[PDB]
Design a protein around this motif. Structure first.
Motif, mmCIF file in Angstrom:
data_model
loop_
_atom_site.group_PDB
_atom_site.id
_atom_site.type_symbol
_atom_site.label_atom_id
_atom_site.label_comp_id
_atom_site.label_asym_id
_atom_site.label_seq_id
_atom_site.Cartn_x
_atom_site.Cartn_y
_atom_site.Cartn_z
ATOM 1 N N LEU B 94 36.056 14.621 -6.058
ATOM 2 C CA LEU B 94 36.989 14.834 -7.152
ATOM 3 C C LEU B 94 36.378 15.084 -8.518
ATOM 4 O O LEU B 94 35.314 14.550 -8.833
ATOM 5 N N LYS B 95 37.089 15.863 -9.338
ATOM 6 C CA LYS B 95 36.770 15.997 -10.764
ATOM 7 C C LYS B 95 38.093 15.866 -11.521
ATOM 8 O O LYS B 95 39.158 16.060 -10.941
ATOM 9 N N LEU B 96 38.028 15.519 -12.801
ATOM 10 C CA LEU B 96 39.231 15.418 -13.626
ATOM 11 C C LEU B 96 39.687 16.765 -14.105
ATOM 12 O O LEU B 96 38.871 17.612 -14.431
ATOM 13 N N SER B 97 41.000 16.930 -14.210
ATOM 14 C CA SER B 97 41.573 18.144 -14.766
ATOM 15 C C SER B 97 41.390 17.949 -16.262
ATOM 16 O O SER B 97 40.868 16.907 -16.697
ATOM 17 N N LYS B 98 41.836 18.931 -17.033
ATOM 18 C CA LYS B 98 41.759 18.884 -18.491
ATOM 19 C C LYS B 98 42.582 17.703 -19.023
ATOM 20 O O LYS B 98 42.087 16.894 -19.831
ATOM 21 N N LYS B 99 43.818 17.591 -18.534
ATOM 22 C CA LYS B 99 44.711 16.513 -18.926
ATOM 23 C C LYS B 99 44.120 15.177 -18.547
ATOM 24 O O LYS B 99 44.305 14.202 -19.263
ATOM 25 N N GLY B 100 43.430 15.122 -17.412
ATOM 26 C CA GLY B 100 42.707 13.903 -17.033
ATOM 27 C C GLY B 100 41.661 13.555 -18.088
ATOM 28 O O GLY B 100 41.511 12.390 -18.461
ATOM 29 N N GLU B 101 40.928 14.565 -18.567
ATOM 30 C CA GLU B 101 39.876 14.349 -19.576
ATOM 31 C C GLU B 101 40.496 13.809 -20.875
ATOM 32 O O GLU B 101 40.021 12.820 -21.443
ATOM 33 N N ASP B 102 41.597 14.434 -21.292
ATOM 34 C CA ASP B 102 42.330 14.064 -22.507
ATOM 35 C C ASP B 102 42.752 12.599 -22.527
ATOM 36 O O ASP B 102 42.526 11.922 -23.530
ATOM 37 N N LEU B 103 43.355 12.117 -21.433
ATOM 38 C CA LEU B 103 43.779 10.710 -21.332
ATOM 39 C C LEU B 103 42.610 9.748 -21.180
ATOM 40 O O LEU B 103 42.692 8.600 -21.642
ATOM 41 N N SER B 104 41.553 10.175 -20.485
ATOM 42 C CA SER B 104 40.346 9.356 -20.383
ATOM 43 C C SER B 104 39.873 9.067 -21.813
ATOM 44 O O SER B 104 39.693 7.918 -22.197
ATOM 45 N N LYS B 105 39.755 10.126 -22.604
ATOM 46 C CA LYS B 105 39.352 10.034 -24.009
ATOM 47 C C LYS B 105 40.244 9.088 -24.837
ATOM 48 O O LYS B 105 39.747 8.264 -25.612
ATOM 49 N N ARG B 106 41.556 9.190 -24.656
ATOM 50 C CA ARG B 106 42.477 8.309 -25.365
ATOM 51 C C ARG B 106 42.366 6.864 -24.860
ATOM 52 O O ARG B 106 42.691 5.914 -25.586
ATOM 53 N N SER B 107 41.895 6.685 -23.628
ATOM 54 C CA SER B 107 41.696 5.339 -23.082
ATOM 55 C C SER B 107 40.460 4.654 -23.678
ATOM 56 O O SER B 107 40.448 3.434 -23.878
ATOM 57 N N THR B 108 39.414 5.429 -23.951
ATOM 58 C CA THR B 108 38.166 4.872 -24.506
ATOM 59 C C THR B 108 38.290 4.626 -26.010
ATOM 60 O O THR B 108 37.781 3.622 -26.506
ATOM 61 N N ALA B 109 38.955 5.547 -26.713
ATOM 62 C CA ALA B 109 39.251 5.418 -28.135
ATOM 63 C C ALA B 109 40.629 4.752 -28.285
ATOM 64 O O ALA B 109 41.578 5.373 -28.717
ATOM 65 N N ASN B 110 40.728 3.470 -27.946
ATOM 66 C CA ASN B 110 42.009 2.754 -27.974
ATOM 67 C C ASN B 110 42.646 2.636 -29.362
ATOM 68 O O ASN B 110 42.276 1.767 -30.144
ATOM 69 N N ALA B 111 43.627 3.498 -29.644
ATOM 70 C CA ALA B 111 44.291 3.533 -30.961
ATOM 71 C C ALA B 111 44.933 2.229 -31.395
ATOM 72 O O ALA B 111 45.028 1.967 -32.592
ATOM 73 N N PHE B 112 45.364 1.410 -30.440
ATOM 74 C CA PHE B 112 45.933 0.102 -30.750
ATOM 75 C C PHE B 112 44.865 -0.938 -31.142
ATOM 76 O O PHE B 112 45.166 -1.910 -31.860
ATOM 77 N N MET B 113 43.644 -0.763 -30.637
ATOM 78 C CA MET B 113 42.532 -1.663 -30.951
ATOM 79 C C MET B 113 42.021 -1.309 -32.330
ATOM 80 O O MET B 113 41.665 -2.182 -33.113
ATOM 81 N N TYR B 114 41.949 -0.016 -32.601
ATOM 82 C CA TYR B 114 41.529 0.470 -33.898
ATOM 83 C C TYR B 114 42.442 -0.003 -35.018
ATOM 84 O O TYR B 114 41.938 -0.544 -36.007
ATOM 85 N N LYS B 115 43.759 0.182 -34.877
ATOM 86 C CA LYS B 115 44.699 -0.282 -35.901
ATOM 87 C C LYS B 115 44.525 -1.777 -36.134
ATOM 88 O O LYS B 115 44.488 -2.227 -37.267
ATOM 89 N N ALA B 116 44.415 -2.537 -35.048
ATOM 90 C CA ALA B 116 44.172 -3.977 -35.121
ATOM 91 C C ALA B 116 42.897 -4.347 -35.893
ATOM 92 O O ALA B 116 42.894 -5.313 -36.653
ATOM 93 N N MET B 117 41.822 -3.584 -35.692
ATOM 94 C CA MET B 117 40.553 -3.843 -36.356
ATOM 95 C C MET B 117 40.577 -3.377 -37.821
ATOM 96 O O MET B 117 39.800 -3.860 -38.650
ATOM 97 N N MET B 118 41.444 -2.424 -38.135
ATOM 98 C CA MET B 118 41.587 -1.945 -39.494
ATOM 99 C C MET B 118 42.234 -3.059 -40.338
ATOM 100 O O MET B 118 41.899 -3.236 -41.505
#
Lengths: 144, 146
Positions: B94-118
């Motif tokens: 298997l390989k990830l589709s483009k959309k798979g790559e996009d969500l993987s990226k959003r999973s590593t850069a957790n926007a909820f963790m960032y806001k919390a740390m801000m």
């Protein structure tokens, strides 16, 4: 500091993630020294906290399948670490004395302490004091 | 405090921060439409394109049956693509589709963790923030040596 709050946050989160990854390795070694896998140890620890817990809830709480949880439970019963509260997913469990002794031993991770002890020999007393105070400040600010 | 007491304090604090980070990781997963296990799979596939289902299970430390169900689910959602068209096979790669790559990226850069740390950073001085990062980075570097 040249970097933005955002770049700083990334660096901090990467750093914590890296520490946690290293810490998981030492957690494996500690499990292994007790003769268990990390998953076997997590199960024992849940059962320690929740005596009489059912297998259905144990499975959900570990976020695993029922077939694998039933196999793991069977394995812990084979090792004499857990006991069935009814010997007649509905099964309820508690630890044997042997299960409790291992669970307690697992709380003190000798491998992680030796490793952090070496780290401390390469930190100054002021760094140690500050490291503790700043992470605790982060923890407490996160809790609210 | 004795060094043993300071080690304990640090380890408990790190553990506690990891516990809080996990909750934000759950919020983030929910916002991406996926379970934590689905994202774990996505992330493994991202770093190892062409990985086999047989090896994917072993790396995730999951059942063969669950891995095969989870894989077909990620294919249904368009997030992974088979490199040779049998969905339940251990030999499937298997390989990830483009959309798979996009969500993987959003999973590593957790926007909820960032806001919390801000919000955390707002209650810390510029000097405290530089030392927090510097000292934690030092700890990581020293851990990687022994």
């Amino acid at each position: 500091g040249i970097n933005t709050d955002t770049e700083n946050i990334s660096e901090l989160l990467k750093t914590y993630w890296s520490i946690q990854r290293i810490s998981a390795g030492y957690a494996d070694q500690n499990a292994a020294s007790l003769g268990l896998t990390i998953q076997q140890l997590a199960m024992i620890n849940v059962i320690y906290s929740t005596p009489g817990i059912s297998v259905a809830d144990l499975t959900k709480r570990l976020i695993i399948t029922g077939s694998s949880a039933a196999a793991n439970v069977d394995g812990l019963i084979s090792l004499g670490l857990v006991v069935k509260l009814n010997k007649t997913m509905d099964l309820t469990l508690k630890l044997s004395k042997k299960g409790e002794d291992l669970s307690k031993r697992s709380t003190a991770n000798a491998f992680m302490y030796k490793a952090m002890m070496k780290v401390f020999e390469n930190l100054t007393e002021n760094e140690i004091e500050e490291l503790i105070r700043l992470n605790k400040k982060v923890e407490t600010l996160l809790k609210k």
